[PDB]
PDB file of N, CA and C in Angstrom:
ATOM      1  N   UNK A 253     141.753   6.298 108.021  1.00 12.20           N
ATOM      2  CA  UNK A 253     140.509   5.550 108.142  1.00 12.20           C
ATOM      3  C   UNK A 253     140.188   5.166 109.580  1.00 12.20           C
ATOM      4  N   UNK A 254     141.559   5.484 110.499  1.00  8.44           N
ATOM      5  CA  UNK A 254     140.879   4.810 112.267  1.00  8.44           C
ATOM      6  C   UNK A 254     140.535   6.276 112.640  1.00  8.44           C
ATOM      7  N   UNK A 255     141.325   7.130 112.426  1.00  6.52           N
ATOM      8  CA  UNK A 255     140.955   8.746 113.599  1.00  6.52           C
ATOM      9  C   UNK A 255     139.409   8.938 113.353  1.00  6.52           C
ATOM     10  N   UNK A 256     138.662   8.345 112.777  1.00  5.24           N
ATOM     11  CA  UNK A 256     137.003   8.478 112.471  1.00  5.24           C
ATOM     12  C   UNK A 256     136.644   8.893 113.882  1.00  5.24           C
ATOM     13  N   UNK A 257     136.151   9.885 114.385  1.00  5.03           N
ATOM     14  CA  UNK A 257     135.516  10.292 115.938  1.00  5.03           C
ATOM     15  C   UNK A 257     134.258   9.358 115.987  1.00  5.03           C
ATOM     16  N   UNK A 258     133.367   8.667 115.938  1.00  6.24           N
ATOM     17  CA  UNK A 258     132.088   8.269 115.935  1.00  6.24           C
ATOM     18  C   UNK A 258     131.343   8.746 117.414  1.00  6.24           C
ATOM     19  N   UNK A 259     130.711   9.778 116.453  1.00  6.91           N
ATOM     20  CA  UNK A 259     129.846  10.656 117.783  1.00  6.91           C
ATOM     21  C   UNK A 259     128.586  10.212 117.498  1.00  6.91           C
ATOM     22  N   UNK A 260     127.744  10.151 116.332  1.00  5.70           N
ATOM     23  CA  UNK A 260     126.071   9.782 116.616  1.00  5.70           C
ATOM     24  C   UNK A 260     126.068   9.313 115.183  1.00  5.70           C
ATOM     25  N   UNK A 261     124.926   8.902 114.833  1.00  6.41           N
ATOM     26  CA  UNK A 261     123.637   8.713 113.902  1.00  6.41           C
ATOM     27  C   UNK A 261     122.627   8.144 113.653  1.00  6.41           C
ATOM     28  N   UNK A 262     121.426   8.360 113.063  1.00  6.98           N
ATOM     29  CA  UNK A 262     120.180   8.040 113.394  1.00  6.98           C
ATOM     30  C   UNK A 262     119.645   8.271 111.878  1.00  6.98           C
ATOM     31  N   UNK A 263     119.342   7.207 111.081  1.00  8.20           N
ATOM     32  CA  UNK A 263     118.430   7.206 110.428  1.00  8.20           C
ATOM     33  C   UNK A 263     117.161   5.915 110.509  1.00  8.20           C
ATOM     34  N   UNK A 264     117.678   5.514 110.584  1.00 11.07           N
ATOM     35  CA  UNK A 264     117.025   3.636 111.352  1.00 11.07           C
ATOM     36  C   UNK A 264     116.327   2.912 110.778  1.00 11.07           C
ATOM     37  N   UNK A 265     116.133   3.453 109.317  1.00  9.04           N
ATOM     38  CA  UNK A 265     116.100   2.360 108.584  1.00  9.04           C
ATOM     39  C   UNK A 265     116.684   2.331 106.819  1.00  9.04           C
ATOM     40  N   UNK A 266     117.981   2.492 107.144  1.00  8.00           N
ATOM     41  CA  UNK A 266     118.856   2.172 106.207  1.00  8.00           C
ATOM     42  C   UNK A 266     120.937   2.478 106.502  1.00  8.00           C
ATOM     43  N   UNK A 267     121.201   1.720 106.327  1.00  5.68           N
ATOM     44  CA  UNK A 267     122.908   1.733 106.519  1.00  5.68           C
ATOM     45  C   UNK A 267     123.277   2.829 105.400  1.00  5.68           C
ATOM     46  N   UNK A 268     123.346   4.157 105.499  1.00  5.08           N
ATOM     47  CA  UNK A 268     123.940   4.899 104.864  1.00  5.08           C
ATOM     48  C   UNK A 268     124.971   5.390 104.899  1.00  5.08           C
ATOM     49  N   UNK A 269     126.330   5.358 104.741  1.00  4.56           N
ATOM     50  CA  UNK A 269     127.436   5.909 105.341  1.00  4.56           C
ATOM     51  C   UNK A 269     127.875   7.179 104.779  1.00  4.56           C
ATOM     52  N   UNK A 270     127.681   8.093 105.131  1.00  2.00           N
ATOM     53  CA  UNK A 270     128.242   9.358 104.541  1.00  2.00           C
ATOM     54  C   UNK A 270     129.882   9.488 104.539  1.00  2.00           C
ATOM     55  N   UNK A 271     130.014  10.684 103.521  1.00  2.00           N
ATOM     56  CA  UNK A 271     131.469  10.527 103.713  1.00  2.00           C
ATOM     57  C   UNK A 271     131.748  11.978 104.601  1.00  2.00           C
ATOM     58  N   UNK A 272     132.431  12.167 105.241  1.00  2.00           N
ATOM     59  CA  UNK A 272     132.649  13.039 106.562  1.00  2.00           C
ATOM     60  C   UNK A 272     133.978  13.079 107.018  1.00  2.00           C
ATOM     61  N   UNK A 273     134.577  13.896 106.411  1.00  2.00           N
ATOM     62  CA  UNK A 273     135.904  13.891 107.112  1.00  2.00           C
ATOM     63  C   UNK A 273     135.932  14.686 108.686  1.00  2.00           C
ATOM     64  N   UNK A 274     136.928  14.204 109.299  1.00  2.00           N
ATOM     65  CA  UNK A 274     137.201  14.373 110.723  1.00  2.00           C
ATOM     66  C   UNK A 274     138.066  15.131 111.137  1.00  2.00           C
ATOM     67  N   UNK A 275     138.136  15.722 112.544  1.00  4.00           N
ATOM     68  CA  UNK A 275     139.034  16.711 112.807  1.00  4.00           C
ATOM     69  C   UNK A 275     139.901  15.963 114.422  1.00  4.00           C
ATOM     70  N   UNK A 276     141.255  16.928 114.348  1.00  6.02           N
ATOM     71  CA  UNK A 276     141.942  15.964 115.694  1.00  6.02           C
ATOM     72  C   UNK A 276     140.890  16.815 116.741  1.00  6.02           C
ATOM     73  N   UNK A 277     140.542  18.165 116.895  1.00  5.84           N
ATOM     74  CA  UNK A 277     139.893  18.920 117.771  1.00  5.84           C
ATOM     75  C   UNK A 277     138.415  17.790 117.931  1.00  5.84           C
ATOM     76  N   UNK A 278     137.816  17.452 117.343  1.00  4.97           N
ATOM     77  CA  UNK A 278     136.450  16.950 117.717  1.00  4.97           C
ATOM     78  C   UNK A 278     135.895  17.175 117.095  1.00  4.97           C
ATOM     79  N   UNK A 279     135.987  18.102 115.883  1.00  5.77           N
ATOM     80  CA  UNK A 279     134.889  18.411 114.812  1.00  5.77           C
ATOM     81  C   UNK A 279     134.582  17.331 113.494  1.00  5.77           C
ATOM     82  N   UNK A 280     133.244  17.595 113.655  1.00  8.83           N
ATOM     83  CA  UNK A 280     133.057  16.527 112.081  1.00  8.83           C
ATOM     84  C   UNK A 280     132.388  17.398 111.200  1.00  8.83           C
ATOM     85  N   UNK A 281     133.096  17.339 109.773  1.00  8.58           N
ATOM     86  CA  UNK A 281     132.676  18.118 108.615  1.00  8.58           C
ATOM     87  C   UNK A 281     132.600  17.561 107.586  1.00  8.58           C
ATOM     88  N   UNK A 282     131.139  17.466 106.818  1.00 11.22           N
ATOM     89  CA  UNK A 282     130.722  17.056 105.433  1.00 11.22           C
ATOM     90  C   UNK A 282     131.375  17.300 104.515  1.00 11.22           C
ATOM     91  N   UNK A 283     130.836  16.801 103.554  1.00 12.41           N
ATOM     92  CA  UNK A 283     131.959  16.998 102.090  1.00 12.41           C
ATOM     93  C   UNK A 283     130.848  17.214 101.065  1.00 12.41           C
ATOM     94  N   UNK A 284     130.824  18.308 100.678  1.00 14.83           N
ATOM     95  CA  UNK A 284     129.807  18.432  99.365  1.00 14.83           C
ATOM     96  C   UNK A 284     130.646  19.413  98.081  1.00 14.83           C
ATOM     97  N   UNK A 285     130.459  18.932  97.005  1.00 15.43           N
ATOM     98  CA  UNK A 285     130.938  19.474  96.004  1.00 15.43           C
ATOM     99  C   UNK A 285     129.738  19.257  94.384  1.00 15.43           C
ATOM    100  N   UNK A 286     129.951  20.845  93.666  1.00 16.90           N
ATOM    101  CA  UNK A 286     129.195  21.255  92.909  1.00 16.90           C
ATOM    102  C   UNK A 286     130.205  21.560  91.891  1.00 16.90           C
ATOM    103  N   UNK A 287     129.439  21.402  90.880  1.00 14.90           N
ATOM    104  CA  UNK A 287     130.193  22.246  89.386  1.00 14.90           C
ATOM    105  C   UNK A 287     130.291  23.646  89.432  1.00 14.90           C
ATOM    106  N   UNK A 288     129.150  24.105  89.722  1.00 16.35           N
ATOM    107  CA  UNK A 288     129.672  25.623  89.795  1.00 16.35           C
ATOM    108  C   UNK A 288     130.152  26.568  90.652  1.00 16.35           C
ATOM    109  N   UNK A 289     131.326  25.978  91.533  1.00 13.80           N
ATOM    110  CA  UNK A 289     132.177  25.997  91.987  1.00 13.80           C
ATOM    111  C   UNK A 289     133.446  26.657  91.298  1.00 13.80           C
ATOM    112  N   UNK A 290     134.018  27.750  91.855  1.00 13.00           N
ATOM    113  CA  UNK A 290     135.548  28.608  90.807  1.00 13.00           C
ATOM    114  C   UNK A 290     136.067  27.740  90.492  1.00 13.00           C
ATOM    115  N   UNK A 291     136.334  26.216  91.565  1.00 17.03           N
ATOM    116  CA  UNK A 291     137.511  25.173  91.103  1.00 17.03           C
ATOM    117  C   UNK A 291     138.777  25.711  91.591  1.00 17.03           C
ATOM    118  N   UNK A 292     139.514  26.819  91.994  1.00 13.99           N
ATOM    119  CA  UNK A 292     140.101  27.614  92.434  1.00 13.99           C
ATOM    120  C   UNK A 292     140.049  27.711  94.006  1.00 13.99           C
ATOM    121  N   UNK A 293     139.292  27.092  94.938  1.00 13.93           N
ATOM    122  CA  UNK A 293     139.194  27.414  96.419  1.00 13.93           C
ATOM    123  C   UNK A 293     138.296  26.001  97.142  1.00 13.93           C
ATOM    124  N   UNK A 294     138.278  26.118  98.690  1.00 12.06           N
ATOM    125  CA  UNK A 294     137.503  25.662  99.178  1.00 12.06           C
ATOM    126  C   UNK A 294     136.874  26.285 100.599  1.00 12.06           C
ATOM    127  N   UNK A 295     135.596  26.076  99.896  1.00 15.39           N
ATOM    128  CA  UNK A 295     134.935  26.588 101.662  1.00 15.39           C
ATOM    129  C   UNK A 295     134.416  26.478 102.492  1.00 15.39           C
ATOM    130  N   UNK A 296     134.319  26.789 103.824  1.00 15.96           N
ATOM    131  CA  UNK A 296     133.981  25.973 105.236  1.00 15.96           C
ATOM    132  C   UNK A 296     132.447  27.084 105.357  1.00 15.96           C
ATOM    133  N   UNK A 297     131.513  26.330 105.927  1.00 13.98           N
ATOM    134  CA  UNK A 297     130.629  27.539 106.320  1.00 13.98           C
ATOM    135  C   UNK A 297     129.920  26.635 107.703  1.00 13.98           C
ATOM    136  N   UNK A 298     128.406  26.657 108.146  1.00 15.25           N
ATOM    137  CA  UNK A 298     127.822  26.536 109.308  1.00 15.25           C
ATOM    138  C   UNK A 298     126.405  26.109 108.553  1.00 15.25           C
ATOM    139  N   UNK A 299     125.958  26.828 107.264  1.00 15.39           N
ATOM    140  CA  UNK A 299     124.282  25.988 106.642  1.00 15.39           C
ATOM    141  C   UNK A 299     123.483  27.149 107.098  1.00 15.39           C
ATOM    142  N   UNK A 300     123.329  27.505 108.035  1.00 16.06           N
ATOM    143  CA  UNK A 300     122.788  28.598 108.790  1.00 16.06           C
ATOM    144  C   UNK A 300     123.694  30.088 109.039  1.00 16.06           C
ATOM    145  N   UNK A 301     124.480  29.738 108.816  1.00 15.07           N
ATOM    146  CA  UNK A 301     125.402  31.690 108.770  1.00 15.07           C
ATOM    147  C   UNK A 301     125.300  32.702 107.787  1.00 15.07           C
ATOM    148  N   UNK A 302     124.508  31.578 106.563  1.00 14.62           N
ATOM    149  CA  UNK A 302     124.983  32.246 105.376  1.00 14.62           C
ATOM    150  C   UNK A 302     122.778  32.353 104.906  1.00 14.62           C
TER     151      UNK A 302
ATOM    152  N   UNK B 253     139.237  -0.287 101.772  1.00 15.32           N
ATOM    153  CA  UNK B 253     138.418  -0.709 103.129  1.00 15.32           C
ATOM    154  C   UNK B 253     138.111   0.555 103.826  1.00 15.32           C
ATOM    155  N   UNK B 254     138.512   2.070 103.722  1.00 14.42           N
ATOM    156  CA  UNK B 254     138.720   3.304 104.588  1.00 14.42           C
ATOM    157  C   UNK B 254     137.844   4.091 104.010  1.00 14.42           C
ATOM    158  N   UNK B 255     137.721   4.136 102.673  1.00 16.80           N
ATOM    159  CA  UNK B 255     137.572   5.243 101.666  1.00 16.80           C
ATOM    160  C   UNK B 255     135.839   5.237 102.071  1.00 16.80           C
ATOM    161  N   UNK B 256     135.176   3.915 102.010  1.00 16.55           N
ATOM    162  CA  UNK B 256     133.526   3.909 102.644  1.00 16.55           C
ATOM    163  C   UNK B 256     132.984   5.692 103.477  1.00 16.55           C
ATOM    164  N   UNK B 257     132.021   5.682 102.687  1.00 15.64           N
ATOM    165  CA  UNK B 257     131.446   6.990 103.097  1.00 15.64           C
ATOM    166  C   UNK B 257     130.189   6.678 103.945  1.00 15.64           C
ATOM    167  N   UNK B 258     130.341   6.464 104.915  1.00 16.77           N
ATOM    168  CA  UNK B 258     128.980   6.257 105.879  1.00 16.77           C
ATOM    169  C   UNK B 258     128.235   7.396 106.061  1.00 16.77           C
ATOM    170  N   UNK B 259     126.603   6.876 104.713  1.00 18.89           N
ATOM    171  CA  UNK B 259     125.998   7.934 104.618  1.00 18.89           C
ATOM    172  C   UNK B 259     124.924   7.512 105.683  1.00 18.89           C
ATOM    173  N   UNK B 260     123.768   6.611 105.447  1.00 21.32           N
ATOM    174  CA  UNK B 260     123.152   6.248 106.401  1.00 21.32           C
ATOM    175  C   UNK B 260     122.520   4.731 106.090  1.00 21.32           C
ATOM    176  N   UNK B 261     121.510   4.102 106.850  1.00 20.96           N
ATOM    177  CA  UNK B 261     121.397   2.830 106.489  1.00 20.96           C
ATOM    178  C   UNK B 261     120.197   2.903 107.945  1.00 20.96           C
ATOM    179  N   UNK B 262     119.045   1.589 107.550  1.00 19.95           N
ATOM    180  CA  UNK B 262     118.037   1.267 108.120  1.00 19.95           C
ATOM    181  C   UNK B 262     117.567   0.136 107.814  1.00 19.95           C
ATOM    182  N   UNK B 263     117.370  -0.784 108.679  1.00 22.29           N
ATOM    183  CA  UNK B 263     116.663  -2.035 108.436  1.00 22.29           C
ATOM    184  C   UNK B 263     116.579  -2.521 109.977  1.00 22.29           C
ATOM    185  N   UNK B 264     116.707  -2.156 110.839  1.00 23.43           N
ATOM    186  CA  UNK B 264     116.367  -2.064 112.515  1.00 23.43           C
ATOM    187  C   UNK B 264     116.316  -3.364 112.581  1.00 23.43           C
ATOM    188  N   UNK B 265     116.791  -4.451 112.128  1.00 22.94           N
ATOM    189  CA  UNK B 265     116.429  -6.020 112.819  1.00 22.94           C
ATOM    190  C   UNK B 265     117.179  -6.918 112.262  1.00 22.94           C
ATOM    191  N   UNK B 266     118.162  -6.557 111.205  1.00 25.11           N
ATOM    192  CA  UNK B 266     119.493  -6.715 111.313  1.00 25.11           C
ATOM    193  C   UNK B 266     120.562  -6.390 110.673  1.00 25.11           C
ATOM    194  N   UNK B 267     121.798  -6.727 110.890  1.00 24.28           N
ATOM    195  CA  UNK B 267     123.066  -6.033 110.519  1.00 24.28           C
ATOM    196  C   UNK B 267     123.316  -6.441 109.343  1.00 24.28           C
ATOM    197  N   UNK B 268     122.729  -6.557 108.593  1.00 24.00           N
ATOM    198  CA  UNK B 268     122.983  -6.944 107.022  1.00 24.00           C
ATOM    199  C   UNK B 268     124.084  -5.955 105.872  1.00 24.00           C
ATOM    200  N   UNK B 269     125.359  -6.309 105.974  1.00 23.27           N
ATOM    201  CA  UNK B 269     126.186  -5.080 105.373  1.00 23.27           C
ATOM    202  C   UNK B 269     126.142  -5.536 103.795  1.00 23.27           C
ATOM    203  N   UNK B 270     126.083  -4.644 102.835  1.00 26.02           N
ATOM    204  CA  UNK B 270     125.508  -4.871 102.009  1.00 26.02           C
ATOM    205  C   UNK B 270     126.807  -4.471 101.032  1.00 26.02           C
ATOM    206  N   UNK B 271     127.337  -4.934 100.061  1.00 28.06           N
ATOM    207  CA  UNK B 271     128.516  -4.692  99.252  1.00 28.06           C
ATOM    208  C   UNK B 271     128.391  -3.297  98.307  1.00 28.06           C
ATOM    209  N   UNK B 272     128.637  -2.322  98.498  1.00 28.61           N
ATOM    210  CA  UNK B 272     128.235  -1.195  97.665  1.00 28.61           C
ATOM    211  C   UNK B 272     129.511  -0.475  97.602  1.00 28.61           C
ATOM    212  N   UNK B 273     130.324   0.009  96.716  1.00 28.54           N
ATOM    213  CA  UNK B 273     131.752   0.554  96.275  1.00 28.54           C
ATOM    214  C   UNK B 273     131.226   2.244  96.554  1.00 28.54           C
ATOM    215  N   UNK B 274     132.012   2.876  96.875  1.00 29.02           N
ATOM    216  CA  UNK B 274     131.816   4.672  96.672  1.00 29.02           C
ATOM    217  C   UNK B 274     132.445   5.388  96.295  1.00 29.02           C
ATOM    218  N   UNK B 275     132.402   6.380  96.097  1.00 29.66           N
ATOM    219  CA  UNK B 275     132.755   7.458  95.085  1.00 29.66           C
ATOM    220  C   UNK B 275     133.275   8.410  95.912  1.00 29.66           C
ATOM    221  N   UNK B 276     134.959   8.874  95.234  1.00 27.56           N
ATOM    222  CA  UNK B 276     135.015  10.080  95.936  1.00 27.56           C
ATOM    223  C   UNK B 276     134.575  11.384  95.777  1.00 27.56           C
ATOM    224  N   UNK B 277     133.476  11.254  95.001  1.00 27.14           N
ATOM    225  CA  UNK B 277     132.529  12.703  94.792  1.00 27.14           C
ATOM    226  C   UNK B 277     131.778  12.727  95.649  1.00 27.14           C
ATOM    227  N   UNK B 278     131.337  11.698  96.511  1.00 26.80           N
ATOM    228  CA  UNK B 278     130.449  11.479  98.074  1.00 26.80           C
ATOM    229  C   UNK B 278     129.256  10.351  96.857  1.00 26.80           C
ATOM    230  N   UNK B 279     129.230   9.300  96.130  1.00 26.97           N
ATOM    231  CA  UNK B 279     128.219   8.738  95.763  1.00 26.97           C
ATOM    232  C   UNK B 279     128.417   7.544  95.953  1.00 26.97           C
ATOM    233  N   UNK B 280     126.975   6.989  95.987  1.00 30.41           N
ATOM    234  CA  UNK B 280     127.293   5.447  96.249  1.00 30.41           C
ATOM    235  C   UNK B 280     126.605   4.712  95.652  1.00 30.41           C
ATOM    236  N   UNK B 281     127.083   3.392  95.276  1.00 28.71           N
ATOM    237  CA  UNK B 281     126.791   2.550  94.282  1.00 28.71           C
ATOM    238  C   UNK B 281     126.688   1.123  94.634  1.00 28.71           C
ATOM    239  N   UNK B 282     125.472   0.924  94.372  1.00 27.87           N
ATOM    240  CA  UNK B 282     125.058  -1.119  94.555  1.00 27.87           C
ATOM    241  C   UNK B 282     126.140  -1.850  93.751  1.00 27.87           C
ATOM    242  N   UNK B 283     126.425  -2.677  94.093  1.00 27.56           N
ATOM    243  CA  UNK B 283     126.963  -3.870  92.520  1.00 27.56           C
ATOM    244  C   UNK B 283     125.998  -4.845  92.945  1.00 27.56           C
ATOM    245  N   UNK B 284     125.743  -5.255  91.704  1.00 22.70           N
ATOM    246  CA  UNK B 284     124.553  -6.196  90.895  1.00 22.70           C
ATOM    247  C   UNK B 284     125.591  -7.462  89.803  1.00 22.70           C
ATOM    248  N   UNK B 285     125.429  -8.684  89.850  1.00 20.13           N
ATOM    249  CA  UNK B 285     126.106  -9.648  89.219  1.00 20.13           C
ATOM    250  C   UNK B 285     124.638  -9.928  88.598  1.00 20.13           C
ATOM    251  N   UNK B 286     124.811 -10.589  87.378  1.00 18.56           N
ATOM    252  CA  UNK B 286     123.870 -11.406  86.553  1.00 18.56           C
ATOM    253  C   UNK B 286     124.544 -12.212  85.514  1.00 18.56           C
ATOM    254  N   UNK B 287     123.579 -13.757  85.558  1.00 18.71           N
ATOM    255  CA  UNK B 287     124.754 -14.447  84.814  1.00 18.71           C
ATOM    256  C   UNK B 287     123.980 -14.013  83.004  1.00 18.71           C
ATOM    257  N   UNK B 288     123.022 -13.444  82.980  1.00 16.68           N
ATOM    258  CA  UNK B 288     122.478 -12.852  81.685  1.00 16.68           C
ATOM    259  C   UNK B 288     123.049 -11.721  81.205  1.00 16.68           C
ATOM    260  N   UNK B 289     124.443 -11.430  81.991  1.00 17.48           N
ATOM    261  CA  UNK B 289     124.746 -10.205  81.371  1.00 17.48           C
ATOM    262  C   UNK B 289     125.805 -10.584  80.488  1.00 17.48           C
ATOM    263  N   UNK B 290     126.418  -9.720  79.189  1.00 15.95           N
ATOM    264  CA  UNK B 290     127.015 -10.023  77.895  1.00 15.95           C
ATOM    265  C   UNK B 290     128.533 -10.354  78.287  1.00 15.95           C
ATOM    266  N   UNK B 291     129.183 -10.287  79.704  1.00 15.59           N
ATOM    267  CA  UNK B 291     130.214 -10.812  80.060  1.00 15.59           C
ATOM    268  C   UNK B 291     131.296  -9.572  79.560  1.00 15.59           C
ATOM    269  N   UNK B 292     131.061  -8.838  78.813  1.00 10.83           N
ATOM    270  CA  UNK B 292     132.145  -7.941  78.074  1.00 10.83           C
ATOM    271  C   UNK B 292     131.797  -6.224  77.878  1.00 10.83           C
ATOM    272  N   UNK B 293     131.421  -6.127  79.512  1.00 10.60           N
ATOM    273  CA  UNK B 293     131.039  -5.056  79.649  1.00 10.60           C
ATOM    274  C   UNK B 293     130.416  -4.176  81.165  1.00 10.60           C
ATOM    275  N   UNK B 294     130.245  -3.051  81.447  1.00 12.30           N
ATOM    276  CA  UNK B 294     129.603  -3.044  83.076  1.00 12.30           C
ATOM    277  C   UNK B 294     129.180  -2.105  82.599  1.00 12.30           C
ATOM    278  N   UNK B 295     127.272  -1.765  82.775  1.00  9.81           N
ATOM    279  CA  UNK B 295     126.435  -1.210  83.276  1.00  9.81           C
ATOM    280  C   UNK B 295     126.494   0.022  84.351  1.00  9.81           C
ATOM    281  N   UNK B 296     125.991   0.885  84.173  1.00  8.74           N
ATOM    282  CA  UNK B 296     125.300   1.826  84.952  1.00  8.74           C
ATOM    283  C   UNK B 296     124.068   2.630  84.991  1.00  8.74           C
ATOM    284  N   UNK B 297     122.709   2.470  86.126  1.00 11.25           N
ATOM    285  CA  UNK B 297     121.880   3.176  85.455  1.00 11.25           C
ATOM    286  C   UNK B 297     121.475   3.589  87.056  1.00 11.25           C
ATOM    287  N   UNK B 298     120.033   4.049  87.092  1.00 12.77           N
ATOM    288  CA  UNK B 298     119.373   4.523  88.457  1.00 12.77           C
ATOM    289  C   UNK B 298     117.986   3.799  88.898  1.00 12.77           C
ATOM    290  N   UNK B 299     117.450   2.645  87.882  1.00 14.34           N
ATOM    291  CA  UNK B 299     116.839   1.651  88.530  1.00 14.34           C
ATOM    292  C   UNK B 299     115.050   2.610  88.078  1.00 14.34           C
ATOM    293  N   UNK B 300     115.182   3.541  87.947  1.00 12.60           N
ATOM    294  CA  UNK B 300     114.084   4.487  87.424  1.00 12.60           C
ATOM    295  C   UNK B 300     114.040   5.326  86.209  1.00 12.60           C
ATOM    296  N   UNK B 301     115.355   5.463  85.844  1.00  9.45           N
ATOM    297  CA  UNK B 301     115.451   6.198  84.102  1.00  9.45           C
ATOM    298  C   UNK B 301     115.189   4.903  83.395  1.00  9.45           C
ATOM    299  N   UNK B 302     114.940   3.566  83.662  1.00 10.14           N
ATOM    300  CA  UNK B 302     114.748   2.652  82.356  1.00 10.14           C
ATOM    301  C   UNK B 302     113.019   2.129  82.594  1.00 10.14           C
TER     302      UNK B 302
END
């Protein structure tokens, strides 16, 4: 709960806290999960690669 | 105290932190007390399905 990087955010009018796990390199990565999902894996992508 | 998913939040004039529990599916949830409620039981709805 401390290694949290706090690099930005901006919505400005509401306290929303997402949940976002963190990386030791500097990266910050979302967390989204669906049912139709194998349940069997997990995967990293970019939003735009695919 | 860690688990908080900082999604986002707005009210630009002040820091008003607001008691809301979250979910590790990424969701988040108000708590609401009422002394009209049946005492022997907890609620859940979306404030627009009723």
């Amino acid at each position: 709960q401390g290694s949290r990087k706090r690099i930005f955010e901006n919505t400005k009018q509401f306290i929303y806290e997402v949940n976002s796990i963190t990386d030791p390199l500097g990266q910050s990565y979302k967390i989204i999960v669906n049912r139709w999902m194998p349940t069997d894996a997990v995967y990293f992508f970019r939003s735009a690669d695919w």
